[PDB]
C-alpha cells in the first residue's frame, strides 16, 4: 500500500479546489499553450464544403493551486480528474459536428508537473466547414481553415498561444493522409483577435492548402469530350450523298454530348456559377452543334 502517499497528495490538491474559477482569476491572464498533431487528414466532402481531420488536440497552462511535493515529479492520471479541475472551454469556430472518441475509455490525457504545469490532450475528429470558390474546378485550390478559441472568456482573461514555433506547431503525420481527390501541400497557422458584442476573443487559425488532382477528371470528362468532338469531325470526311449516315451520326453525337454533360454536372456540388469544366463542355458542345448545322445547310 505505497499508493497512500499519492492519494493523500491528490486529496490535498482537490481539497478546496474550485474548478469553476480560471487559474489566477484576480491576478493575471490565463495563458494556454495549444498544439495539434494531425494523425490523419480525413476526406474532403466537396458536396458539403466540409472536411474531416483527426487530431490529438494538445493544450497546456499553469494552475498554481495544483502544486505538489512528492517522490515522483510528473503525475500521469486516469483522465477523469479533468472533469474535477479547470480546463479551458476551447471550441472550433467553424466546427460543424465533431466527436470526442470515447472508445474504450474517454480518449483523454492529463499530466500535472511538479511546478503546476498541466498538459491536457484529447483525441477527436473535427468536421469543419471549408468555404470553397469553385470557379477553377477541377484545377482549383483551397485553403480550408480551422479556427478555434475560447467560449465565454475574453482576450483579457484567456489568451491562447502556440507551444512550439508556429511553423512547427501543427504537425501532420507521415501516412496520415486519407485524401483521395486532393493533395495536402502545407500548413499555415495564424493567431488573431475577433471582436463581438460580448467582447474580444483570441482566435487561432490553421489553414490547410489543398490542390485538386486533375487525373480522374481528364479521363471522365475531357478525354471523352475531345473524342466526341473528333467524332463530330469525321462526319465531314463522309460524303454528301449518304445523308442518313451523317444525320444519324450528328444526332447521336449531340445525344452523347447531352448525357456526358449531365453526367459531368452530377459529380460537382450544385453551384450558382459556371466552372471551367462547364465552359469546356459548353464550348465543345457548341462545336458539335455547329458541325451538325453546317452539315444541315450543306
Amino acid at each position, epitope marked *: 500500500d505505497n499508493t497512500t502517499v499519492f492519494t493523500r497528495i491528490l486529496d490535498r490538491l482537490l481539497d478546496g479546489y474550485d474548478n469553476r474559477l480560471r487559474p489566477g482569476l484576480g491576478e493575471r491572464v490565463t495563458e494556454v499553450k495549444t498544439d495539434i498533431f494531425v494523425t490523419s487528414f480525413g476526406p474532403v466532402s466537396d458536396h458539403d464544403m466540409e472536411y474531416t481531420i483527426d487530431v490529438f488536440f494538445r493544450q497546456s497552462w499553469k494552475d498554481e493551486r495544483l502544486k505538489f511535493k512528492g517522490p515522483m515529479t510528473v503525475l500521469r492520471l486516469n483522465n477523469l480528474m479533468a472533469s474535477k479541475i479547470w480546463t479551458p472551454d476551447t471550441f472550433f469556430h467553424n466546427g460543424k459536428k465533431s466527436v470526442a472518441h470515447n472508445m474504450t475509455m474517454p480518449n483523454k490525457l492529463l499530466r500535472i508537473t511538479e511546478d503546476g504545469t498541466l498538459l491536457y490532450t484529447m483525441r477527436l475528429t473535427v468536421r469543419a466547414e471549408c468555404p470553397m470558390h469553385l470557379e477553377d474546378f477541377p484545377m482549383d485550390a483551397h485553403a480550408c481553415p480551422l479556427k478555434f478559441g475560447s467560449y465565454a472568456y475574453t482576450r483579457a482573461e484567456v489568451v491562447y498561444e502556440w507551444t512550439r514555433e*508556429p511553423a512547427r506547431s501543427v504537425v501532420v503525420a507521415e501516412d496520415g493522409s486519407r485524401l483521395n481527390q486532393y493533395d495536402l501541400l502545407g500548413q499555415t497557422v495564424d493567431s488573431g483577435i475577433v471582436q463581438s458584442s460580448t467582447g474580444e476573443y483570441v482566435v487561432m487559425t490553421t489553414h490547410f492548402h489543398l490542390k485538386r488532382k486533375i487525373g480522374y477528371f481528364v479521363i471522365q470528362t475531357y478525354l471523352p469530350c475531345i473524342m466526341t468532338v473528333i467524332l463530330s469531325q469525321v462526319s465531314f470526311w463522309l460524303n454528301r450523298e449518304s445523308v442518313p449516315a451523317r444525320t444519324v451520326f450528328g444526332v447521336t453525337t449531340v445525344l452523347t454530348m447531352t448525357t456526358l454533360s449531365i453526367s459531368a454536372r452530377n459529380s460537382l456540388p450544385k453551384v450558382a456559377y459556371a466552372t471551367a469544366m462547364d465552359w469546356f463542355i459548353a464550348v465543345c458542345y457548341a462545336f458539335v452543334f455547329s458541325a451538325l448545322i453546317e452539315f444541315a445547310t450543306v
Partner: antibody
Amino acid sequence: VQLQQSGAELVKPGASVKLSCTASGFNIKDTYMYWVKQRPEQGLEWIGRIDPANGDTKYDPKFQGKATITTDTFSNTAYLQLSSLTSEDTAVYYCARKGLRWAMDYWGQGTSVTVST
Amino acid sequence: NIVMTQSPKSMSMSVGERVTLSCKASEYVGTYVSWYQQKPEQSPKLLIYGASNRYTGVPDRFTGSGSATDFTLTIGSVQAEDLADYHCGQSYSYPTFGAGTKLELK
C-alpha cells in the same frame, strides 16, 4: 521582469568564452530563452534558442557547432559557451526571452566580447 | 531560413511629420513580425508585438500594418527622441531579423 548579464570580456583569439544571463522576477522554465548578437553598427543576428523546461536546443545554420547554449534551472540562468573564435566575432551579445506573441519583449544588458593581442 | 528585407537603409527627416518604414518577408509569416527600437549604446526595446499591436509603455503615435509578407511601421508626429536603430524580426519560424533602419534629424 529583468534580465542581467555578465560584464564585458577581453579574450585572445582561438580561446573559449562563457557568458551568463540570470533572470529575476520570473522562472525560466515557463518561457524560451534566446541569444542574439549585434555587430558594431550592423543589424541583429540570432544565434540559437534553448528550452529550459526540456533542455532541447536549436541553432542557426551558421552557428551550429560553434555556439552551444545551456541552462541552470536553480539559478534561473542561461549560459552561452562558444568553442573557438576568430577575429571577426567581436560584438555585443544580448540575452532575451519570448514575450506575448513570440516577440522578444525583455532583453539583457548586452555583453561586448573584444579580441586583440 | 526566412530572410527579412527592411527598407530604406538610412533616412533623415524633420520633427513633426509622418514617417513610414517597410519590412518584407521572403516566405509567409502570418502576424509574427515584431519591431524593436535600439537607441545608441542601449539594448533593444520591443514596440510592436506581432503584426499591429502596441506594447505596454509605448506611446500612441507608433502603429504598424499587418499582412502575409508586407509589413510597415508608421509614426505620426515625430518627437526628438526617435533617433535610434529600428529593426524588424519574424517569429513564425525560427527567429530572424532584417538589416534595420537608422533615423536621423535634418
